[PDB]
Amino acid sequence: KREHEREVIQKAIEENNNFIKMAKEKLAQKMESNKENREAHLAAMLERLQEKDKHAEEVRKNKELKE
Amino acid sequence: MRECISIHVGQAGVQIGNACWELYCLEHGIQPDGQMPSDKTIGGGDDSFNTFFSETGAGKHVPRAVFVDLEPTVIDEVRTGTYRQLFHPEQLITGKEDAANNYARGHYTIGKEIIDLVLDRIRKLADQCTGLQGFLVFHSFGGGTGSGFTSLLMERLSVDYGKKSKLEFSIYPAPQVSTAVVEPYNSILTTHTTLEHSDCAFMVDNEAIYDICRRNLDIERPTYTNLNRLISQIVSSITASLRFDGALNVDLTEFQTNLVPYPRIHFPLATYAPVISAEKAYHEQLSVAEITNACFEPANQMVKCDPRHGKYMACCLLYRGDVVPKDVNAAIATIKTKRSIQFVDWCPTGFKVGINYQPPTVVPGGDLAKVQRAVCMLSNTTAIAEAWARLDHKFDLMYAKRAFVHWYVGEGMEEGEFSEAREDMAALEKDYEEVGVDSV
Amino acid sequence: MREIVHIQAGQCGNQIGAKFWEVISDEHGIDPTGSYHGDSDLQLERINVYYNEATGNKYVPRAILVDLEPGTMDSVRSGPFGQIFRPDNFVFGQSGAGNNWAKGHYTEGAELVDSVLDVVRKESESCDCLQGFQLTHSLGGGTGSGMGTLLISKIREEYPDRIMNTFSVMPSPKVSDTVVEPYNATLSVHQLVENTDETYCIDNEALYDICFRTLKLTTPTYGDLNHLVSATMSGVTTCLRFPGQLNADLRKLAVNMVPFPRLHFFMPGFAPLLTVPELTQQMFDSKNMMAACDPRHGRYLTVAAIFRGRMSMKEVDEQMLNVQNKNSSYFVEWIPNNVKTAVCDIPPRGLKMSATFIGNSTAIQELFKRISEQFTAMFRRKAFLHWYTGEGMDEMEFTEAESNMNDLVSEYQQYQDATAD
Ligand SMILES: Nc1nc2c(ncn2[C@@H]2O[C@H](COP(=O)(O)OP(=O)(O)OP(=O)(O)O)[C@@H](O)[C@H]2O)c(=O)[nH]1
Ligand SMILES: Nc1nc2c(ncn2[C@@H]2O[C@H](COP(=O)(O)OP(=O)(O)O)[C@@H](O)[C@H]2O)c(=O)[nH]1
Numbered sequence A: 001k002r003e004h005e006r007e008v009i010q011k012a013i014e015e016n017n018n019f020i021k022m023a024k025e026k027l028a029q030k031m032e033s034n035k036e037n038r039e040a041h042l043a044a045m046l047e048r049l050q051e052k053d054k055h056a057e058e059v060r061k062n063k064e065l066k067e
Numbered sequence B: 001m002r003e004c005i006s007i008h009v010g011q012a013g014v015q016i017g018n019a020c021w022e023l024y025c026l027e028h029g030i031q032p033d034g035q036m037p038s039d040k041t042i043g044g045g046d047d048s049f050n051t052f053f054s055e056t057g058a059g060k061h062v063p064r065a066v067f068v069d070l071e072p073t074v075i076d077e078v079r080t081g082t083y084r085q086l087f088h089p090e091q092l093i094t095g096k097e098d099a100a101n102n103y104a105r106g107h108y109t110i111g112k113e114i115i116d117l118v119l120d121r122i123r124k125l126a127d128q129c130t131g132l133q134g135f136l137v138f139h140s141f142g143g144g145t146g147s148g149f150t151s152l153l154m155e156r157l158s159v160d161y162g163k164k165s166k167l168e169f170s171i172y173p174a175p176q177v178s179t180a181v182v183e184p185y186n187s188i189l190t191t192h193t194t195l196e197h198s199d200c201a202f203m204v205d206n207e208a209i210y211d212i213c214r215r216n217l218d219i220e221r222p223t224y225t226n227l228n229r230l231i232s233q234i235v236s237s238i239t240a241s242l243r244f245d246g247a248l249n250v251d252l253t254e255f256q257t258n259l260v261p262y263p264r265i266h267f268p269l270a271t272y273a274p275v276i277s278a279e280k281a282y283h284e285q286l287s288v289a290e291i292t293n294a295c296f297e298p299a300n301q302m303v304k305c306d307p308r309h310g311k312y313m314a315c316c317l318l319y320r321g322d323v324v325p326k327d328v329n330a331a332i333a334t335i336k337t338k339r340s341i342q343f344v345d346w347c348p349t350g351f352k353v354g355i356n357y358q359p360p361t362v363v364p365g366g367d368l369a370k371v372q373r374a375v376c377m378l379s380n381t382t383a384i385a386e387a388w389a390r391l392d393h394k395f396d397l398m399y400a401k402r403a404f405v406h407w408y409v410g411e412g413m414e415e416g417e418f419s420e421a422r423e424d425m426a427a428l429e430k431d432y433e434e435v436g437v438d439s440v
Numbered sequence C: 001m002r003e004i005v006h007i008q009a010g011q012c013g014n015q016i017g018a019k020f021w022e023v024i025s026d027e028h029g030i031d032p033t034g035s036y037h038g039d040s041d042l043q044l045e046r047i048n049v050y051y052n053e054a055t056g057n058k059y060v061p062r063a064i065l066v067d068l069e070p071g072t073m074d075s076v077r078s079g080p081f082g083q084i085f086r087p088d089n090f091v092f093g094q095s096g097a098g099n100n101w102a103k104g105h106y107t108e109g110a111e112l113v114d115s116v117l118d119v120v121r122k123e124s125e126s127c128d129c130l131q132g133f134q135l136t137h138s139l140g141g142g143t144g145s146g147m148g149t150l151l152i153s154k155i156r157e158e159y160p161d162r163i164m165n166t167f168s169v170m171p172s173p174k175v176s177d178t179v180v181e182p183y184n185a186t187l188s189v190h191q192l193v194e195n196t197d198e199t200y201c202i203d204n205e206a207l208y209d210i211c212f213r214t215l216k217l218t219t220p221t222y223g224d225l226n227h228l229v230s231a232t233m234s235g236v237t238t239c240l241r242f243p244g245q246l247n248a249d250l251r252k253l254a255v256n257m258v259p260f261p262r263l264h265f266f267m268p269g270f271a272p273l274l275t276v277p278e279l280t281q282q283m284f285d286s287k288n289m290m291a292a293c294d295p296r297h298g299r300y301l302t303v304a305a306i307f308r309g310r311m312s313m314k315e316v317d318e319q320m321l322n323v324q325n326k327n328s329s330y331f332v333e334w335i336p337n338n339v340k341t342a343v344c345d346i347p348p349r350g351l352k353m354s355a356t357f358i359g360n361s362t363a364i365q366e367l368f369k370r371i372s373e374q375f376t377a378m379f380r381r382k383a384f385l386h387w388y389t390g391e392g393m394d395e396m397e398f399t400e401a402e403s404n405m406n407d408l409v410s411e412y413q414q415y416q417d418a419t420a421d
């Protein structure tokens, strides 16, 4: 009986810690994933604005090469 | 001991907090500067009101509360308001930019920048507790902060405080006082994320409160102030057992034992009575039987639904004022033989009763009449799932076209989170359907 | 606070830009010297949204004035409230666009744009928390059109996490005889659909028809057209400028108005041109739209409306519910509660009560089809195309701008035809 009593409270501690542990990890995973995505979205936005600059160079270049 | 820390998140949470704490002060005879003449133990004490108020050596009674918002203008009114002396400046936390009606910004982009600070300030309150019981979290479903930041906070609180109890007062969105078209999105996302981290959540349908203010107090177009003063009375009724003592006083945790049959089934339906104007209450005494019978009038519910078309899994009556058990039992006996009250077959049908002799209180220049007795019924009904159904439908209409989803994706979220959240709600609607089915 | 940085480019942009500042400076109760002489604290509650506070309680508009020709710059400085604008925020070239988009976007403007950004950067760096930019310009010209869209792209590079809003004036043969305008418009739209979050489609065709047929003004002046614009711009920014039941910013407006990123072209409306039921029916009437489009030729994705003045709010709520019910077919059902009503206690100047309307309607395609029709009529003949290729442009950039605006139309048509089931 004493042995069973120890196993019950130990199980309660284990499940409590497991819940804390999983919650801490599930959150870290989410904030990381969200950081990647938001960055990749802003990075893509800047890349095609970069393409608009490169294009403008090719336009101004094309002008002086027609004179 | 048995201290309770309140956390008020976003505009709705903060402004409701203002109403609640103002009401608490008047019920306990606490002045706007925090002084409480009737309290003879200076600088401390183990009285009942100490569950919600700490004490400084100068005799100031300070709310065990943190106010958080990602925008400063709402809390700035608290900082310069009537009860500005009540709170230590560190209890009032603000950012410079709100979540813009976006769950993603409240949970990730903007919220992550202030989450560590909030937890530190919460920790400072907890370290002043000799026996912290749990947290009470006030927030809206629809706001970006009330939605996004709350769910982040709830997750972080489960990590930092383990299985310490966390209760919710959640404002369910209504079109009459809507602030964004994406409130259904924010609602579903928060409910999903917070579900595992909340032990009990009291939803407050703004349309229900809007209707009651129009119908019972004859307010042609209720303001947030009108809604909040009514809400604070319901909140006061629920927390009354924690803030007062009495022979017939029943602790909220005991009601909670009956109200939550399964972890996910933790959304009680609140019903309050009497809500009546001064004009109508004059020369008009509402008896115990009358206010108790009013608890089974759907028009008086905090959430729009029809319990008469559902099944009960618990029924609790929280009385306050001039009330004795004899009149309660008589009123209940009458009601049982005249109302559509049916329980599931796996639960006992007895009503759990609590009485706090401390009479109801009203705020100066308010609309609510001051009455000698009031009652708040807390019932666990399958009918509350109707609130989920209405929200989930509005969610489906927009998400089938992915309307407004790009505002969330742009903040780093994925469509998988939307579908994951919606499936959890679908399972929750199914859960409430299953518990209502008769046993084999 | 939450600051908005104002920018006005080209002739048209500075005209309506100056008018906008004249009107709201009056509403917030400040004189051309920048001093406050009002009576209500509500005028200064959210004043920092558009104004910087200088020494001796001087309120300076957070505005940047731009043009490739120094002519209009003298007009503003000499015009009323000319002494309120920050002198250093005046950025002017000497060239002049000559209604050439390529000059404003790639040549002349690309040489002046950096000195504009230096002023943008200086204003922005002082902000407590910048929420975004609002630009006033026309799409028919060369500077405000060509260089205006260049600035947007350049500003979006340094502030990709800020809201970009524009008050774009659409060209109309009823007002401007200039032939090349449908080129400048199409090329501008090609930019706005990609790099702006919200665009108020101020349509000269609509502005003309209102003055002529309703206000009974034959041969209407630009002053007449702008009196409509100013009243509109005043209305749609009320929620940004004053405290109310719900306070709004550029982001919260975009979230609620734009269900899909590209579909961010609003048709504004105004009423009158009374009692509550009268106002509500007029603001939903096609005659009161500042964009030459019939809303009953499409469906509303989202709708925003202010009612200004002291009136029965119970009545306004009932009438707005009334209109949605009687006109339910013209609001998409797959977006629940897609109509919101706002209320400001303070009325405009002259009117005891008014109502301004912001509609994200699929009927806006009619406006783009008009431009596209005038565009392709010129492009099939390659008329005046040498003015653009002369600056180094390619025929493709015309084709791409055409097909992109074609997609915008068909995309508006897609969600018009969509159903719940
Ligand atoms: N009952 C009640 N509801 C409120 C109150 N204030 C806001 N709400 C509701 O809250 C919802 C919007 O959430 P908010 O709390 O206003 O927004 P937030 O939490 O500050 O988050 P942000 O979007 O970042 O501003 C709306 O549906 C409102 O009806 C209030 O004082 N009382
Ligand atoms: N409503 C209005 N439209 C204008 C005004 N001035 C010019 N426009 C329009 O703008 C177009 C000409 O562009 P403009 O502003 O002159 O080009 P820019 O000054 O070189 O950028 C025409 O289609 C006009 O209808 C004005 O004061 N009010």
Ligand SMILES: O=C1NC(=O)[C@@H](c2cn3c4c(cccc24)CCC3)[C@@H]1c1c[nH]c2ccccc12
Residues within 6 Å of the ligand: B178, B179, B180, B181, C235, C236, C237, C239, C246, C247, C248, C249, C252, C253, C254, C256, C257, C302, C303, C304, C305, C306, C337, C338, C339, C340, C341, C342, C358
């Ligand atoms: O103050 C506000 N902020 C917002 O986001 C606006 C809004 C638009 N929709 C909303 C919805 C819900 C709630 C708020 C808003 C439904 C769809 C469109 C709202 C507003 C009402 N009338 C206006 C007039 C001018 C400028 C802003 C507004």
Ligand SMILES: [Ca+2]
Residues within 6 Å of the ligand: B039, B040, B041, B042, B043, B044, B045, B046, B047, B055
């Ligand atoms: Ca004490």
Ligand SMILES: [Mg+2]
Residues within 6 Å of the ligand: B010, B011, B071, B098, B143, B145
């Ligand atoms: Mg807020």
